[PDB]
Amino acid sequence: AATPAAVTCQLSNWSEWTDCFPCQDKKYRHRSLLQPNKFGGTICSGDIWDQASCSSSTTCVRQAQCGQDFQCKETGRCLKRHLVCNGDQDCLDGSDEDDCEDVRAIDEDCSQYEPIPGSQKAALGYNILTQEDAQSVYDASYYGGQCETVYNGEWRELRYDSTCERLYYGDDEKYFRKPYNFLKYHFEALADTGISSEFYDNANDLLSKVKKDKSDSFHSQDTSFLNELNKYNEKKFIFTRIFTKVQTAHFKMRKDDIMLDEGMLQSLMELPDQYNYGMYAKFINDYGTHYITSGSMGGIYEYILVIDKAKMESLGITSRDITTCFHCKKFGGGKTERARKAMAVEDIISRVRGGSSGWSGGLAQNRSTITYRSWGRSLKYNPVVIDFEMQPIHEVLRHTSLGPLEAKRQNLRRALDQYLMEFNACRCGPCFNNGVPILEGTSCRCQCRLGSLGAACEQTQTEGAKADGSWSCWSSWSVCRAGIQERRRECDNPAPQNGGASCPGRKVQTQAC
């Protein structure tokens, strides 16, 4: 197909200003994303949320609300009072630790151990729509006054002392302090690799020929006929696929008494008990659709090579030659046809997720024991999350130290179901040639793989390739009158092309009315 036409971005009108929230003195409103600029297209100038200053004309007390437990001024963080003067600032204002001339309240000397390096990423929220980290959900640094420590199994670092003659291992890295939000952090060295490689080749070749000669004399005639065919076929196929998965630690987030981040805490305190999609969608946008509660830290290497080649050739000939004499005469007449075609494709993908730009690049280029070992060393200093379980952001609220948030949680569930509908990449147009549709902000792209090009990846450089289809999204819910509400979807965005697979999901989805 040629490219689809561009579409302009479109937003609804502003919703009516939310009444001024007393503690904020702020008014909020939202628009709806009626259309992203699927292709080309003017981007919308404006954001889909807006806020303005106000005056409430009413006070709020909430600074006092929690004050049985120590409540900071800057933040809603409300602390068990033994954390006051504990020796470790537990809210960003430090109001728990100022004026603590009764220093006897300190809990322990633990600051000799740094926090687990790379623990902060586990604290971040996750957006399933974009596979991007959001703002922090967990507090990455709150310890709850505990000095709980994790043994760093890789602490051994060579040192040399020229004043002696000793080569010895230093010990600073030997332990980390575990932040309160981790139930488990567990160093463990594993690797696995799998390699598969395959070759199939066939060459098939036939020749066939007849010569038929007949001669008679009475005057004379001589005739020769020929038919001949050559037909040669070759197929070559090579596949290889390497996976290497180093694990260096596992983590698990605490399922109870979760201490939310200061920013999430404040923003959740700002949301109304009344449902307001603008507010809760802003919350889901900032803190992500999901949060993480499992971990593997590690490195991955993946390599794929496919080569396919074919050759076909054929030649055909048919001929007659004649001579006769009565004066002697000679004739000939015939036809020959020939064809050749040759095809090759070579596709390679190598990717490294891991610990240094240098040796991630080097290992992406040249798989070897040198790059494997040097990248493995780099995985010591910068492991990356290789696997994580996650759950919807609202399930965090059930487990907070804030107690119940039933109404806010149900609001956030409803808002999430709408957010996961409204910003789905379904609204980016058909990415052809197995291009990947992406929606970001109010705009769309196709990420086009190298065999594909153009605003929709629509122009593959070759004549065409087998490209699987993808679903449009689900339609609106039915205006149900029976107890059942219904949603339909079809594998047409794009349809399966050049013999590509159907997309595998469900056509029909159903809900209680």
Binding site: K26, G46, S53, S356, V384, R449
Partner: protein, 407 residues
């Protein structure tokens, strides 16, 4: 004829805006000009001195309990003496003789340049990056030490950078597609020949990702002052000057890295067709197009790698590793998530919402003004490109010339 570009008459003069003592005018570009007609270089807006007609309203308010620095930023008093230069001027701490109360408790710490430059401004036209509107030197008096990851060094995270994670990835994609045909067949007959090759390689290296903070963010003194100078009255040329100085968007999150790219294309072919209908066709072509790109890393390694990629020479992985490490010295903003610059207009600023709405209008104007939409169609389906105050057309097809007039 080609067309030298054309602009509207001037708008009527605004009224004199008080405090800023000036009147303004606007003038749209009706037609960009094209085909080597003269550029619209002339300014889209104009301004003039005026003796103010009426009382000015002050810009300052007493912050109250917060200190009020020489630069006008107000900081909560725990930041007094803190020694972090929390106002960009040291009036947070220059007052203080003693008790500096310094954060990071005598621990080894560094400033990180990646965090300092985080949150680049962006002009949507060309996606060009600009200086960060964020201060990134205010620390809110926190320490929040993070590891450089590629190096055993700890840097203090600036307050506005909510995350800066060195989640390093390195990829290489390569494809070769290679094709040959010979065909020697209405009463047609043939001698068609083809020799086609596509080779395409790109390798992205991601050094890390920043996320800017969604709330309570602190902006540079010059940016907030330029919002102060911004006329309340929607004077398009002044808002365009602001957008030109800071861009229309900021990266609320960005991936930093480097990239190499190489495209090799060949198409050698010929046709002959002969026969009779119920025919004397001949043609030949050669096309042979090499393009190479390197982004990021230090010159000294980057260009050597770009060369060794253009050469068929087998790359010594030492060179690739050298450039890929040098990406840490000079990263590129290989990706970002944009948010409109007006979301950085601080709330509770005077007429903040008005300035926000007027910036949204000014962005609408800026996009539609320098959009090729109001430019002349290419003659033969070539892409029209608004280059700079002029349109020129380029054809990917065999057509040629600045309007694709010919082939």
């Amino acid at each position: 004829s080609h067309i030298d570009c054309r602009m509207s008459p001037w708008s009527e003069w605004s009224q004199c805006d008080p405090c800023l003592r000036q009147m303004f005018r606007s003038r749209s570009i009706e037609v960009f000009g094209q085909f080597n007609g003269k550029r619209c270089t002339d300014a889209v807006g104009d301004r003039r001195q005026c003796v103010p007609t009426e009382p000015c309203e002050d810009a300052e308010d007493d912050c109250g309990n917060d200190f009020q620095c020489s630069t006008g930023r107000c900081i909560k008093m725990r930041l007094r003496c803190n020694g972090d230069n929390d106002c960009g001027d040291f009036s947070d701490e220059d007052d203080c003789e003693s008790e500096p109360r310094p954060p990071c408790r005598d621990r080894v710490v560094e400033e990180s340049e990646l965090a300092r430059t985080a949150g680049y401004g962006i002009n949507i036209l060309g996606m060009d990056p600009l200086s960060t509107p964020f201060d990134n030197e205010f620390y809110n008096g926190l320490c929040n030490r993070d590891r450089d990851g590629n190096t055993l060094t700890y840097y203090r995270r600036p307050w506005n950078v909510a995350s800066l994670i060195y989640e390093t990835k390195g990829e290489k994609n390569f494809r070769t597609e290679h094709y040959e045909e010979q065909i020697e067949a209405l009463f047609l007959s043939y001698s068609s020949k083809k020799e086609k090759m596509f080779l395409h390689v790109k390798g992205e290296i991601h050094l890390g990702r920043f996320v800017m903070r969604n709330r309570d963010v602190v902006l540079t003194t010059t940016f907030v002052d330029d919002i102060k100078a911004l006329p309340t009255t929607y004077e398009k040329g002044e808002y365009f000057a602001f957008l030109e100085t800071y861009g229309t968007h900021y990266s609320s999150s960005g991936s930093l890295g480097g990239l190499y790219e190489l495209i090799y294309v060949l198409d050698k072919a010929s046709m002959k067709r002969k026969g009779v209908e119920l025919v004397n066709i001949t043609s030949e072509n050669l096309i042979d197009d090499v393009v190479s790109l390197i982004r990021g890393g230090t010159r000294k390694y980057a260009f050597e790698l770009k060369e060794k990629l253009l050469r068929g020479t087998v790359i010594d992985v030492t060179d690739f590793v050298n450039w890929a490490s040098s990406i840490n010295d000079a990263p590129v903003l290989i990706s970002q998530k944009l948010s409109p610059i007006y979301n950085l207009v601080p709330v509770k600023m005077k007429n903040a919402h008005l300035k926000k709405q007027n910036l949204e209008r000014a962005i609408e104007d800026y996009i539609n003004e320098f959009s090729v939409r109001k430019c002349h169609t290419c003659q033969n389906g070539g892409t029209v490109i608004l280059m700079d105050g002029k349109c020129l057309c380029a054809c990917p097809f065999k057509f040629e010339g600045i309007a694709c007039e010919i082939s």
